Each structure stands twice: as structure tokens, then as C-alpha cells.
């Protein structure tokens, strides 16, 4: 229940503001910057600010803080969801999120803000629906918003019915300094870019453990996602009733389902680091990377980031496979490898000097993270069974899907 | 299917070698479609196995069934889930409709000896579905 949502700037200037209830004065935005500065200097800065009896909830955007001032005890989660929807709509309409587009599309930006929410209650949240009624280059509102199906616009015609799916896998491993993995969770991502004619109702079917157990086929390799979230077009009733993933696919790229469950398998890449750091004399980087993934899968664009000393200079890299580049801005050395086949063993030996004068304050030990991304690999083993594409007119669809395995929160605690 | 005919002798030899009673990851062939075996496909596979032999009368085993399912998946891309047996005790009907192969006793359900037997009526009669309507949805 934010009183007014406004877009700020890096210098405190409000790029654009739009009051929705009028219960909060527009002059409260000026005091938001001093409050944020005081909070940052004291460690008490939070996204939800508080200016007396009015709370100024702000979200750190790409270039401006989306401050949504509120007065009463409005839904904080609702305000955050509205801000996220507004950010997504702006990203869809404008490819750049900065001051260049804030002051360049004000005529359409004001109309979009007015149409999105009224009296603090959001009304329009579909990017396609908003673009079909408000454009920067007006007819009556589309019937899709009024109709029940607000995620599948009717009347869409295409020459070919091709849908491109993406089995995105995020391998996150939380390995402590002792060598044991604490947080090892893999989050699935079933995103399909449906581009067909009409409003087909997708019938999602995969090798789900629950579905296999219900059907009596709980003996093969089935993916048991701890948390499964359906898309907006996905009908929750069918999933709760018999796990039937039946919903109208959206026009374009959208996230249908996103699995999320813990992983009990060995890490895809095993990286062991050795720190032979002398006392203000030199530093040793005994970094050894072992590929725990299958040899048939290659980790393309593998970049194992090893944090080097903050004051370290004149470093020498003695590795075997993969180029090592030291970035002064990042204050770390990334063991970048173009192609990392499974089972490969890469050994590196870093050596650099240190300044004679000791550092005044400590810099910490940031965890070492790798950027391995091996496509065409299904670590979870979940295989899609079928995709029920049904249309009233009747057409032969040719859906496609690709499985991509990447490294997410794969951070290894430093020694 | 020349590839299926070639793989049938090796699969039969591997099943015979395995008694009746190391690499991690899940690699996937690029561009190879994956889908469950159809009723017509299951019937054709059962007929081919019966004609070539090595499937009817062979002692049913978990290792042999897994090897056969893996060979079928490699040769045609069919998921190794349609070659399921009905719950015991007794003769286990095919899990997927259209399958002409079923497991029947040859003498705890696990300790019972099972043998693969051809069943033409299985492809036309949903005995497994009738026995377990809940499992069929």
C-alpha cells in the first residue's frame, strides 16, 4: 500500500514520480537521500526506509532507486511485487535501465505508470497486454486483460509453430574452508520460448518422481524437485489434483516451471587451492582443479576465480591448462578455460611478491567461485516425457528444448 | 531396422551372460529425441524380439531388464519405463499398453522366479490397466 512509487537517480534526483493515493507529500523524497546516506555510513541502511510515520521502501535498480513511499501498514510483499513487475515492464519496453531512457520516454512512461496501478492497487502487469494498449510510437483496452486468460493473447497467427525450451541447471555448491560442502542445492529452470499460432494449452510432462510413483513407474531415473513453482499460465488446480501441468503457453519466452531441490551428488568441478603466502615476501597459489563431471560433458567457458592478495603485485602464473589473467579491479585471478572436458585435471602455481609495508587493515577472505557451464548435461537426470500441445484449429507443433548445465552459487570457502 | 537387428544379437548375448539372480553424469546425445515408447512401437519391439528370439522364455532379472531397456533407448530413444511388469505375486503384465512381453512365474514376490513370455492379447487387452486402474490414471 505504497502512497506513491517514484524512480530516483544516483545523485538523489527523482527521474520520475507518480503519486497513487496522495496521502504522502512529494517533498519526502528529498529526505530519502540523507536517510540512505546516514544508514550506509552506519550500516543501518535497508531497502525499506522510514521517514517518521511514512515508510519509503526503495529498491536498488540498475541506475536509480525505485523508492515507493508508503504511509499506512501496506503490504510490503505486495509493494515489492509491484516494484518487480514495474521493473520487468520497463526492461521489456526499454532495453536500457538508466537515466538515458528515464528522461527519453516520459510521455509513455507516465501513461504506463498511470495504467499500471491506481489508488495503490496494481491493475495491469502483463508486458504484452501493456504494450498492446500503451505504446511510445490509443485504442480501447484489450479483452485479454478482462478475460480469464491474461497470459495468452488470442488471435495470434504464425507461419510455423516452433517452441524453444531451455532446461537451465544451476549447480550451487557451498564448500567450506574445511573441504566439506555445506549448501549443495541445484535449482532447475524449465523455460520455453513458445512461438506458434493461436492460444495452445501446453500439457507439460516429465520424468517426475511423484508422477512416476503415482503412475506406478517409480523404478527408473526420476527427478524429485523439493520445490516446484508453476508459471502464471500454469493451472495450480491440475497440479494439486494429479500433477497435470496444463496451461496456455505465453507468446514469447516465459518460465513455465522451476525445480528446486537439494543435491547429494559430488560437485561437477573439484577445486583445491593452496596458499603458500610468505610473510610480506611472496605468495603461492597451488590451485588444482579436478573435473568430477562425466568425461562426455565439457565445461565450456570455465573460469575458476581465485582471490589473490589485495596489495599483491608482479604476479607470475605457472599453470597447465587454461589461461590465467589477473584483474586488478576484481583483486583476484580467474583460471579461465575455454573448454573443460570432464575428468580433466588442471594444476596451477601462482607466484607474486608483496609490498614491504604491511596493510593497515585486513581485507577478508572472499570465497573462491567458478564459472563452469557445461551444456547438454543433465546432472539431475530428469527427462521430459512429452509436451501436450493442443489447439482448437488443429496443427502439428514441433517443440524443441535444450538442457544447459551451469555453475550457480558454486563458491568454495577460502583457507 | 538394420541397427536394431545388429544390436539384438549383442543384447541377447549380454542378457544370457548375466546371471538370472563407475561413470557419473547424465550425458545426452545432441539432437536425439527422447519420448516414451508408444503402443505401436512397443508391439513392434515385442514382435521383433519374439521373431529374433532371446526374449520369450528367458529368465526375468533386474539386470537383464535394465540392459534391454538401455539397449532399446540407445537404438530408438524410447524411455526405459514402458518395459515394466505388473505387480505380483504371479504373472506380471506389461506396464505399457501394446507390449507383447510379460513376466510369468517359472517355478516373497522378489524371490519368485520370473520368465519373459510373449503375450499377443496384451497388445489388445489392457490387463495391466484393468488390474491397476489407479496406476493408469
Amino acid at each position: 500500500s505504497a502512497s506513491a512509487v517514484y524512480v530516483l537517480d544516483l545523485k538523489g534526483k527523482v527521474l520520475i514520480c507518480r503519486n497513487y493515493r496522495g496521502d504522502v507529500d512529494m517533498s519526502e523524497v528529498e529526505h530519502f537521500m540523507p536517510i540512505l546516506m546516514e544508514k550506509e555510513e552506519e550500516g543501518m541502511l535497508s531497502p525499506i526506509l522510514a521517514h517518521g510515520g511514512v515508510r519509503f521502501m526503495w529498491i536498488k535498480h540498475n541506475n536509480l532507486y525505485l523508492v515507493a513511499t508508503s504511509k499506512k501498514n501496506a503490504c510490503v510483499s505486495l509493494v515489492f511485487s509491484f516494484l518487480y513487475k514495474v521493473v520487468q515492464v520497463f526492461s521489456e519496453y526499454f532495453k536500457e535501465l538508466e537515466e538515458e531512457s528515464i528522461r527519453d520516454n516520459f510521455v509513455i512512461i507516465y501513461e504506463l505508470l498511470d495504467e499500471l496501478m491506481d489508488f495503490g492497487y496494481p491493475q495491469t502487469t502483463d508486458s504484452k497486454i501493456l504494450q498492446e494498449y500503451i505504446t511510445q510510437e490509443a485504442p480501447r483496452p484489450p479483452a485479454t486483460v478482462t478475460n480469464a486468460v491474461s497470459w495468452r493473447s488470442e488471435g495470434i497467427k504464425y507461419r510455423k509453430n516452433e517452441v524453444f525450451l531451455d532446461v537451465i541447471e544451476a549447480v550451487n555448491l557451498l564448500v567450506s574452508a574445511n573441504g566439506n560442502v555445506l549448501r549443495s542445492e541445484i535449482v532447475g529452470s524449465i523455460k520455453m520460448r513458445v512461438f506458434l499460432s493461436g492460444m495452445p494449452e501446453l500439457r507439460l510432462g516429465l520424468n517426475d518422481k511423484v508422477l512416476f510413483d503415482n503412475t506406478g513407474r517409480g523404478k527408473s531415473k526420476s527427478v524429485e524437485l523439493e520445490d516446484v513453482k508453476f508459471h502464471q499460465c500454469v493451472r495450480l488446480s491440475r497440479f494439486e489434483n494429479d500433477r497435470t501441468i496444463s496451461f496456455i503457453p505465453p507468446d514469447g519466452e516465459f518460465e513455465l516451471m522451476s525445480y528446486r531441490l537439494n543435491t547429494h551428488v559430488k560437485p561437477l568441478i573439484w577445486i583445491e587451492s593452496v596458499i603458500e603466502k610468505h610473510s610480506h615476501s611472496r605468495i603461492e597459489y597451488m590451485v588444482k582443479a579436478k573435473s568430477q563431471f562425466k568425461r562426455r560433458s565439457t565445461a565450456n567457458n570455465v573460469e575458476i576465480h581465485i582471490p589473490v592478495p589485495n596489495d599483491a603485485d608482479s604476479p607470475k602464473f605457472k599453470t597447465t591448462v587454461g589461461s590465467v589473467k589477473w584483474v586488478p579491479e576484481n583483486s583476484e585471478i580467474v583460471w579461465s578455460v575455454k573448454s573443460f572436458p570432464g575428468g580433466k585435471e588442471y594444476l596451477m602455481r601462482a607466484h607474486f611478491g608483496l609490498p614491504s609495508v604491511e596493510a593497515e587493515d585486513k581485507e577478508g577472505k572472499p570465497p573462491i567461485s567458478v564459472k563452469f557451464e557445461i551444456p547438454y548435461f543433465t546432472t539431475s537426470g530428469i527427462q521430459v516425457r512429452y509436451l501436450k500441445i493442443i489447439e482448437k484449429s488443429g496443427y502439428q507443433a514441433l517443440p524443441w528444448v535444450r538442457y544447459i548445465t551451469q555453475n550457480g552459487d558454486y563458491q568454495l570457502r577460502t583457507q | 531396422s538394420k541397427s536394431s537387428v545388429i544390436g539384438w544379437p549383442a543384447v541377447r548375448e549380454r542378457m544370457r551372460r548375466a546371471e538370472p539372480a563407475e561413470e557419473v553424469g547424465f550425458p545426452v546425445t545432441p539432437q536425439v529425441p527422447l519420448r516414451p515408447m508408444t503402443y505401436k512401437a512397443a508391439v513392434d519391439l515385442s514382435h521383433f524380439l519374439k521373431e529374433k528370439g532371446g526374449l520369450e522364455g528367458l529368465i526375468h532379472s533386474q539386470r537383464r531388464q535394465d540392459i534391454l531397456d538401455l539397449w532399446i533407448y540407445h537404438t530408438q530413444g524410447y524411455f526405459p519405463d514402458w518395459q515394466n511388469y505388473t505387480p505380483g505375486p504371479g504373472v506380471r503384465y506389461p506396464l505399457t499398453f501394446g507390449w507383447c512381453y510379460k513376466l510369468v512365474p517359472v517355478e516373497d514376490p522378489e524371490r519368485e522366479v520370473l520368465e519373459w513370455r510373449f503375450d499377443s492379447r496384451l497388445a489388445f487387452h489392457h490387463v495391466a490397466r484393468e488390474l491397476h486402474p489407479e496406476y493408469f490414471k
Binding site: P375, I404 | F136
Partner: peptide, 18 residues
């Protein structure tokens, strides 16, 4: 070709489930 895994054809439903 495409990085991150080549696109593969998808079926319509579980043919073995009837």
C-alpha cells in the same frame, strides 16, 4: 549449433502410460 546444449525434439505425452 548453439552453446549450452543443442535443441532436441520433444514428445506429446507419455506413450507408455496410455
Amino acid at each position: 549449433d548453439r552453446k549450452g546444449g543443442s535443441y532436441s525434439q520433444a514428445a506429446g505425452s507419455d506413450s507408455a502410460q496410455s
